[PDB]
Amino acid sequence: DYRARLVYPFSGAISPHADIVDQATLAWAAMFGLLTDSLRHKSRRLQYGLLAARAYPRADREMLQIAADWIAWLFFMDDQCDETGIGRDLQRMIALHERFLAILDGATPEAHDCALTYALADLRRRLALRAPDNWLRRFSEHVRLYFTANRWETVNRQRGATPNVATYCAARLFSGAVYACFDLIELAEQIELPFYARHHSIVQQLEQAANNIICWCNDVLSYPKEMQHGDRHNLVLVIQGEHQCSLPEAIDRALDLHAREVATFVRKRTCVPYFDAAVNTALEKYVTGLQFWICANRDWSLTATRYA
């Protein structure tokens, strides 16, 4: 059981609001028309709210609900990208992204805009009530880079071209939208980091390490369903192509890279410089937030129907 090798020298927590938030995320999905024909009794088992509850365990219920609805949005968008025709059609993906980008700039959806565009506009509206412009611009840019990454995946599928390890790992940091999920830690923890701390090389490196761990963990758990769809956006499949090795060996190599990235994250935690008492207090809440996300991703994914 190679899954038992997905271990961390720390553990997570879950918000006491978990089930309330999950029920509300389903009601939200139904309200905005995101639940497709194939899903009726499968809808109950999505449990997207129970991932959010683990990722932001200390958040107030209102802020947690924005995070849960956002996480659900990302799953709904992802299944369109990864399991339908739109992920093989760059021109259809560009037309959709043009609508999302107009909504991220604060435009109102038109009558004939799709459910995902309306739902994205709802999340932006609710975030604008809770966050300053500075934060909203950083979130929006992280979301734009997720769309760019999805268009990158679409070109790979159209060309039938598996990326090399260096290209894949560099792009995978954007294709999972993990940086946009990290932005929400600030709102969950109600912390205001000054510019020089927010963008410090050690903070960027801790964010990169946490993002890598989360994505490579997902890759080990999601290679089966991704292979079932003839997809190629997975460290296991990418390693297999580069090394011309067996699937068991590629899995072994992916888990080695995961273990190494956990150690890098633990090491770099002890390298955060002393700015001042108030800045380092806030900074340690953010970095603790990254740990909660690492654990949430693993803890939710091992039990989720999504990877069963």
Ligand X SMILES: CC1=C/CC[C@@H](C)CC[C@H](C(C)C)\C=C\1
Residues annotated within the binding site for substrate are 172, 225, 306-307
Q: Please check whether residue 56 is in contact with residue 184, taking contact to mean a CB–CB distance below 8 angstroms.
A: yes
Q: Please, which residue, 151 or 275, has the CB nearer to ligand X? A: 151
Q: Under rule CB under 6 A, how many of the chain's residues touch ligand X?
A: 12
Applying CB under 6 A, the span of 83-91, 124-132, 161-169, 176-184 interacting with ligand X comes to 176-184
Among 262, 283, 297, 298, binds ligand X (CB under 6 A): 297
Q: Is 95 helix (H, G, I), strand (E, B) or coil?
A: helix
Applying CB under 6 A, the span of 33-41, 73-81, 101-109, 248-256 interacting with ligand X comes to 73-81
> Rule CB under 6 A: is residue 78 a binding residue for ligand X?
yes
Rounded CA-CA distance 62/136 in Å is: 17
| CA-to-CA separations, 106 to 30, 123, 162, 186, in angstroms, rounded | 23, 11, 36, 21
Residues counted in the chain? 308
| CA-to-CA separations, 94 to 68, 149, 187, 299, in angstroms, rounded | 26, 12, 30, 34
Cβ at position 291, least distance to Mg ion in Å: 21
> Rule CB under 6 A: is residue 214 a binding residue for ligand X?
yes
Among 12, 49, 163, 176, binds ligand X (CB under 6 A): 176
Applying CB under 6 A, the span of 32-40, 57-65, 70-78, 135-143 interacting with ligand X comes to 70-78
> Rule CB under 6 A: is residue 181 a binding residue for ligand X?
yes
Q: Please, which residue, 60 or 78, has the CB nearer to Mg ion? A: 78
Q: Please check whether residue 175 is in contact with residue 181, taking contact to mean a CB–CB distance below 8 angstroms.
A: no
| CA-to-CA separations, 279 to 180, 193, 290, in angstroms, rounded | 22, 7, 17
Q: Could you tell me the end-to-end alpha-carbon distance of the chain, in angstroms, rounded to an integer? A: 14
- The one of Mg ion, ligand X, none whose footprint includes residue 65, by CB under 5 to 8 A per kind, is none
11 contacts: CB under 8 Å, gap ≥ 6: 295
Applying CB under 6 A, the span of 12-20, 67-75, 91-99, 268-276 interacting with ligand X comes to 67-75
Q: Which residues bind Mg ion (CB under 5 A)?
A: 78, 82, 218, 222
Q: What residues make contact with ligand X under the rule CB under 6 A?
A: 71, 74-75, 78, 176-178, 181, 214-215, 218, 297
